[PDB]
Amino acid sequence: TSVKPIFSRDLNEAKRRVRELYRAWYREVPNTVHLMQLDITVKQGRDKVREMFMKNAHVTDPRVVDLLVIKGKMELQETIKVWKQRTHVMRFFHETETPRPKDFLSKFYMGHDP
Amino acid sequence: QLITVDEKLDITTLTGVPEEHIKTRKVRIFVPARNNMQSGVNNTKKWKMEFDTRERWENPLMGWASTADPLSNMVLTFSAKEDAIAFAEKNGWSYDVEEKKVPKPKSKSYGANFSWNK
Amino acid sequence: TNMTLNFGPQHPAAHGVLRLVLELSGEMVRKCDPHIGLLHRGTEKLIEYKTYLQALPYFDRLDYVSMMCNEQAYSIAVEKLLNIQPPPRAQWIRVLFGEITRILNHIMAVTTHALDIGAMTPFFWMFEEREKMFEFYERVSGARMHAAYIRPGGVHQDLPLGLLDDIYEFSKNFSLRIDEVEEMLTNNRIWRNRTVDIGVVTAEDALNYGFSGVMLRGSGIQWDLRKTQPYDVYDQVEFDVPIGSRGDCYDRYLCRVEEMRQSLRIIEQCLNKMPPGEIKVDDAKVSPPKRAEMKTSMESLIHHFKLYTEGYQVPPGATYTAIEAPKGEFGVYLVSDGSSRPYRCKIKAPGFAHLAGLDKMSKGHMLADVVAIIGTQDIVFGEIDR
Amino acid sequence: ITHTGQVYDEKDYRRVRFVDRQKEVNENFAIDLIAQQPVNEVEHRIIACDGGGGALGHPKVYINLDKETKTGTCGYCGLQFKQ
Amino acid sequence: VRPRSDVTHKQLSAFGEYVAEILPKYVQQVQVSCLDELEICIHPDGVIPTLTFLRDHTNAQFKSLADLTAVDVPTRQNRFEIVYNLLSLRFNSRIRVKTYADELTPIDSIVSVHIAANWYEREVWDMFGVFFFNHPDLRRILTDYGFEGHPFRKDFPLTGYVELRYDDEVKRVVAEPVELAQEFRKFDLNSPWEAFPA
Amino acid sequence: SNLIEVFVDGQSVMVEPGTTVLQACEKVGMQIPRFCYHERLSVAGNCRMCLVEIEKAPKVVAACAMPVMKGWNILTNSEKSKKAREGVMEFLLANHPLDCPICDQGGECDLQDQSMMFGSDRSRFLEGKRAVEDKNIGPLVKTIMTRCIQCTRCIRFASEIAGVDDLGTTGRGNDMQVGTYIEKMFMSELSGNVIDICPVGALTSKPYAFTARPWETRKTESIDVMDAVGSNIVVSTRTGEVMRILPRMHEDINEEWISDKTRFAYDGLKRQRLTEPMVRNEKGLLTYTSWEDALSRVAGMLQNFEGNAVAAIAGGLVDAEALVALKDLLNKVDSDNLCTEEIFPTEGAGTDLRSNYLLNTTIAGVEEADVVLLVGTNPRFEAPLFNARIRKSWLHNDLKVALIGSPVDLTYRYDHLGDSPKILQDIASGRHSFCEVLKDAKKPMVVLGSSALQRDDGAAILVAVSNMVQKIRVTTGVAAEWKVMNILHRIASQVAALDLGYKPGVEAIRKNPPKMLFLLGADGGCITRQDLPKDCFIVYQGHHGDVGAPMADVILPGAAYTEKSATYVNTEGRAQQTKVAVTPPGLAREDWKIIRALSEIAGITLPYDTLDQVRNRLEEVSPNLVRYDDIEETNYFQQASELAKLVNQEVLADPLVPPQLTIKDFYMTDSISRASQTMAKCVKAVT
Ligand code: SF4
Ligand code: SF4
Ligand code: FES
Ligand SMILES: [Zn+2]
């Protein structure tokens, strides 16, 4: 315990920042899908944003959340600024890779080490 | 002023590891034993934690060994058992520590074997 | 976005790979944000997994225009950690090939600068001289560039029987070749214009942004790590640092042409005064045993086997050793556990600091000015990206 | 076929490779070349074996041709020496 | 044997005390190594203060930042060991000031003290993940635009987790989990016999 | 008291009087460079590479030898003790043949290192070298003895750890060659240890001659499954196939030594190995097919057959995790006919109290015993690293060994009470002579081998021994934590099986024949297809096709202990964990999953789906399985006897004889062993 704060003193304040970033991304998804001529649906993309913002829903510690948005914000800048060519963005969608089943029987049938 | 958190530093969310290799990878914290071949003990000093071994299929074109597991060759070295356990907890890898086993003191004396009695 | 325009990775003007996301109001540059890492390759992490002698070839690749001078920096660093120093002949060699390498870098920097400016004949004139130098490398190391000749305990093999004489014939003439370039560019009524008063850097600002190279020397700050902190036997030679005033692209250039001149003065001496002796430390502990010895003496085979298979086993410690690589201060911070393989090896690249300055140098400048300034920093993306 | 007789087989899924392109194998296989080497007769109990040429050979080893029962074979050249 | 000049070992030691007295507050350990170098170790909070004193003190002018790096000792609670190497053009010398930073306990930025650090601090964030407060623009410099994970951390696999190939179906470059055709052979090299420390 | 204070470079370590100078340096942490000194081998002083310099003393002393005295400061890194090593290493290297790129102890050399750290940069031996004549010490150890530094650790081990007393020094001068005077092979178990103990690569392993080089070998620490001592071992794997298995030290179980079987039968692990799941075709031959098809062949038969029509004969090297996955499955179709091939008498308390079937006096308790009553087993060939235990405790301590079996080569002096199970009654009556010898013993131990139990009167033999242990305990008045009765096994999956409540013996399957049998790695002949019902629908679950495969309607290949993170337990119940050294070959899969998957196809799915979960399962059925490296102290011998007293059985006059009468008996036993080309070469060498 006894840990020095990074940007917010408590999860509460931290959550404020997450809200802002969500908004940011939400407002940005449409633009990217157009400035990168990505073949995705704005709605679809916006769900992806939600996915990511929740993939890390479990974090309880304030310090970890603050870094997470710092990092998140940085990603936003890149996307918003065309620095990230489509190849970079679409990677988020994991479009080419073949999905792996998580069913035990499925894995048994395919891989030595599951 | 400092803030209070009872949450075990878990930073699994910042490390940047694919989900599969954080929830299916068991690492063992062990002090390396000594190849019986040599009698030196300088490689049995520091604790090491090693990730579980994974597939090593033969390559069809040249017959070279091929591996799909990124964390295979990685063995991190930690000076003390407590510190190594900490690394597993904050990185979220499962751990199964093995106690160091050091050679027991053995009493030796050149005179003793010269004893015809025994 | 003020017409943001990526200078683009594929551009003859951009040495190697440089995306300079630039916002230009018409033909004026408002802000330059260089992007890097188009050539990051992992050189610093890879070294941690390799032994000291098998990480020596990485240093030649860090900034390969200056192939060897880089190797000397790791050498020195590994020698310091071991508290071993190379034999006298090896030291002179390293200064001999250290300087030859400086010329090679300056011929690259001055002639490639001109090709971007638009002068193309200087490059062909001096690349022929370069070629001739490479041949020295090859006849000493075996490779035209990427030699691996300067190893952590001296050089690898004595000079071939006859090289010194040829490093003379060449040196005896190269001057005229520098003189020619001059009659073509130093006073061209046009070179001056595109170069003079472009990218002026103050003296205080140059030290502040860590420029540490000709870039500092061009602004009039007098600092040559080779005179201030002598390494090898650069102390026993006598040369004049070419300091500059009214620091600008033209002045620094003149400085690089002047060190080409001063290096010929250092090369001459090295040929005139190189000592008879051995070219590698005699400690089989650090330097590999001679092949006749390893094939007739048991202690030498054991030392050959262990050195090649396992390694030096440097004593635990950390050092930052900096030389004066042709670009500027090249330093290796080599932290080392007692193990035969290093723990960290941050390579300080004269170039990570110089690029950063592109922003503070090219302000209110035209697209052509940016091309001139990347040239006056001798940016080799290998050292910056590492 | 080759030294250790590599034989991608009639049923292997790799013999596909040589189709329209030959395989790399060796004539004058070494396995038989030293066997073709005469036994170096010697006078001394022990003999050296620089491999021939000193520095341009193998780390010198001394072989004990002490028993005619066995011709010492330097582990490096495979040269049998007949006491 | 290297040509040590004790003349130096002493003068730099004396400066090390000088600095230790001048800033009792942040200096934890000051030591002159045998190579003959000097390293003043400071509490992370002393980043701004200790540097500034060295950049702007008549008896210790350390104008240029040679390098900013972060070794990562995983065992150490504070994983990273930010090391700043500085050079005095006047008095001719070099001092290294090294601090300790954990993954989520950021260090202050010295871009103010030396603008050279603007880039190296971005380099330390990209490779090791330490964060620098008050940095003008901290963002990945060396790694790919979408890279996930900090590469030079000792806990990051060399080959990494993603590699790129061009896929026709999608006519675009596409990441896939790394599949290597000859894994890095991990030769064990440490010898079980030590060397009696001199 | 008894704590001298000696200074190692002024560190004031304190050591018991009688500790060698080398030992004093060890506790400070310094290492004296040493050759010819091994911790569990007698001090010999041959090399004198350990010369150190006690302060204020004219000459340097032999570390391994001088008992450190009061207040003598050892100076291990002095200017003298380095000239005492720079000059010895000069000599060892002078007569050495430089074929380090032949010597497969290349990176595993304690003589290049010490040269490369403590020795000299160059040589001055301009004179000629010597050569010795390579001879044959057997089919396992390649003695290129021109390498030998005459350090006499072999001659010690071959006499002190193993009782071979064959290897010896021959001659004097610089042609002292340490090889058998007449060419008699060094045939004994414990033989391969010489390789590991010779620091020079003079004699090394012949199978692992030139397949690898140590820096490359990735080393995974696992457990011996060939024998029930459960010796710790390190499996050295390169690019995914095991290259060598060498011992790793466990003070209590194998203290740096492993058997000849469990280090040269890694080759057997690589052939005749099952990989794809074949099924019986209409034609009547096993045809390779995908899991899905092979599993539902088995699942469909399982759903059709009810309890007691489905049985499992497990046995040999199967892990505890598969054993609980096979019991949980067959109970979900209500047959508890799960059984093991080795019959442990189960008419009184068997399998219920966990001391009827364990060597509860620890492997390390053989060291503190007084009289051992070996009854009906050849330890030399049933638990070689426990025979060694009684070897060391008969030499360094004073154990009085007595055998009631066949008079057999035991590597020590035993007392052959006789070859008759009824003379056990003789001692119980106090009639036989030894009866007093025990009376005189303050800490005695009986050991009943499992092979005696495997005869028909095994129930009677256990009961007869328990009676004698009872009055031995009463007459000696031995303390409770000292435990006289223990029984040693010779099958790795027997203590684990009995632990999970598997009932020993195939006697139950014999009385009622199961429609379906899922052989789980069983290569024994305990039931045969003629014996089985007409349907004879049995499915082999194992790694090597030996006896159970060709008589199998389904083949579900599994793994071996080099290829799974399973658990095993040796004879005194110390559970231990094998780690995966190499991924299992072909479509072959881990034993526990095949059975979890068959259950999913069957529909009676087992609860666990990950191995930590199966470890949690093992916890509910049994304690030892989850706590590793932890022997279970308390036992309930007194209630065991009460039930033994109720049991009445006749010990037949037939002498009790160990099946492994001589060493050819020993080399090939289990599946992996049988499949060994190295073991086969060893077998013909004996024959
Ligand atoms: S033993 Fe084998 S390896 Fe060790 S030195 Fe003699 S030859 Fe070289
Ligand atoms: S063989 Fe190995 S052990 Fe026996 S003496 Fe020669 S070296 Fe010492
Ligand atoms: S080690 Fe000192 S006597 Fe052999
Ligand atoms: Zn030869």
From Swiss-Prot, chain B:
Q: Which GO terms describe its cellular component?
A: mitochondrial inner membrane; mitochondrion; respiratory chain complex I
Q: Which GO terms describe its molecular function?
A: NADH dehydrogenase (ubiquinone) activity
The protein's assembly and partners: This is a component of the iron-sulfur (IP) fragment of the enzyme. Interacts with BCAP31 and TOMM40; the interaction mediates its translocation to the mitochondria; the interaction with BCAP31 is direct.
Family according to the record: Belongs to the complex I NDUFS4 subunit family.
Q: Where in the cell is it found?
A: Mitochondrion inner membrane
Q: What is its main location?
A: mitochondrion
Q: What's the gene?
A: Ndufs4
Q: Please identify the protein, giving its name as recorded.
A: NADH dehydrogenase [ubiquinone] iron-sulfur protein 4, mitochondrial
Q: Which domain of life is it from?
A: Eukaryota
Q: Example GO biological process term?
A: dopamine metabolic process
Disrupted gene: phenotype observed = Reduces the levels of assembled mitochondrial membrane respiratory chain NADH dehydrogenase (Complex I) and the rate of Complex I-driven oxygen consumption. Growth is retarded although activity and behavior are not affected during the first 4 weeks. With aging, results in increasing lethargy, rapid deterioration of motor ability, weight loss followed by death. Mitochondrial ultrastructure is normal, although large subsarcolemmal clusters of mitochondria are present in the soleus.
Q: Which UniProt keywords apply?
A: Electron transport, Membrane, Mitochondrion, Mitochondrion inner membrane, Phosphoprotein, Respiratory chain, Transit peptide, Transport
Q: How does it sit in the membrane?
A: Peripheral membrane protein
Swiss-Prot record, chain C:
Which reaction is this enzyme known to catalyze? Answer: a ubiquinone + NADH + 5 H(+)(in) = a ubiquinol + NAD(+) + 4 H(+)(out)
Which terms are listed as keywords in the entry?
A: 4Fe-4S, Acetylation, Electron transport, Iron, Iron-sulfur, Membrane, Metal-binding, Methylation, Mitochondrion, Mitochondrion inner membrane, NAD, Oxidoreductase, Respiratory chain, Transit peptide, Translocase, Transport, Ubiquinone
Q: GO CC terms on record?
A: mitochondrial inner membrane; mitochondrion; respiratory chain complex I
Keyword DNA-binding assigned to the entry: answer is no
Q: Which cofactors must be present for this protein to function?
A: [4Fe-4S] cluster
Membrane topology recorded in Swiss-Prot or TrEMBL? Peripheral membrane protein
Q: What is this protein called?
A: NADH dehydrogenase [ubiquinone] iron-sulfur protein 2, mitochondrial
Q: Which organism is it from?
A: Mus musculus
Q: What is the lineage of its organism?
A: Eukaryota, Metazoa, Chordata, Craniata, Vertebrata
Q: Which gene encodes it?
A: Ndufs2
Task: Please give the range of the full-length protein represented by this chain.
Answer: 78 to 463 of 463
UniProtKB/Swiss-Prot annotation, chain D:
Give residues where N6-acetyllysine occurs. Answer: 60, 82
Q: Which GO terms describe its biological process?
A: aerobic respiration; cellular senescence; circulatory system development; DNA damage response, signal transduction by p53 class mediator; fatty acid metabolic process; gene expression; kidney development; mesenchymal stem cell differentiation
Phenotype reported upon loss of the gene: Male and female mice are fertile but produce smaller litters and pups have a lower neonatal survival rate. While mice are normal during the first 4 months of life, they are prone to rapid onset weight loss and sudden death after this period. They display cardiomyopathy associated with a doubling of heart weight, impaired systolic function and a reduction in functional capacity. Males are most severely affected, with a propensity to develop cardiac failure and diminished survival after 4 months of age. Defects are due to membrane respiratory chain NADH dehydrogenase (Complex I) deficiency.
Which membrane topology term applies here? Answer: Peripheral membrane protein
Which UniProt keywords are given for this protein, alphabetically ordered? Acetylation, Electron transport, Membrane, Mitochondrion, Mitochondrion inner membrane, Respiratory chain, Transit peptide, Transport
Tell me where it mainly resides. mitochondrion
Q: Where does the record place it?
A: Mitochondrion inner membrane
Q: Which family does it belong to?
A: Belongs to the complex I NDUFS6 subunit family.
- The name under which this protein is listed is NADH dehydrogenase [ubiquinone] iron-sulfur protein 6, mitochondrial
Record lineage: Eukaryota, Metazoa, Chordata, Craniata, Vertebrata
UniProtKB/Swiss-Prot annotation, chain F:
Q: Where does [2Fe-2S] cluster bind?
A: 36, 47, 50, 64
Function of the protein: Core subunit of the mitochondrial membrane respiratory chain NADH dehydrogenase (Complex I) which catalyzes electron transfer from NADH through the respiratory chain, using ubiquinone as an electron acceptor. Essential for catalysing the entry and efficient transfer of electrons within complex I. Plays a key role in the assembly and stability of complex I and participates in the association of complex I with ubiquinol-cytochrome reductase complex (Complex III) to form supercomplexes.
What domain of life is recorded for the organism?
Eukaryota
**What reaction does this enzyme carry out catalytically?**
a ubiquinone + NADH + 5 H(+)(in) = a ubiquinol + NAD(+) + 4 H(+)(out)
Q: Which amino acids does the record list as binding [4Fe-4S] cluster 1?
A: 96, 100, 103, 109
What positions does the domain 2Fe-2S ferredoxin-type occupy?
Answer: 2-80
Q: What PANTHER family does the database record attribute to this sequence?
A: NADH-UBIQUINONE OXIDOREDUCTASE 75 KDA SUBUNIT, MITOCHONDRIAL, RESPIRATORY NITRATE REDUCTASE
What keywords are annotated for this sequence in UniProt?
Answer: 2Fe-2S, 4Fe-4S, Acetylation, Electron transport, Iron, Iron-sulfur, Membrane, Metal-binding, Mitochondrion, Mitochondrion inner membrane, NAD, Oxidoreductase, Phosphoprotein, Respiratory chain, Transit peptide, Translocase, Transport, Ubiquinone
Catalytic EC class: translocase
Is Phosphoprotein among this UniProt entry's keywords? Answer: yes
The organism is Mus musculus
Report any Pfam family annotated for this entry: Molybdopterin
Q: Name one GO biological process term.
A: aerobic respiration
User: Domain 4Fe-4S His(Cys)3-ligated-type spans what residues?
Assistant: 80-119
Its membrane topology, per UniProt? Peripheral membrane protein
Kindly provide the name given to this protein in its UniProt entry: NADH-ubiquinone oxidoreductase 75 kDa subunit, mitochondrial
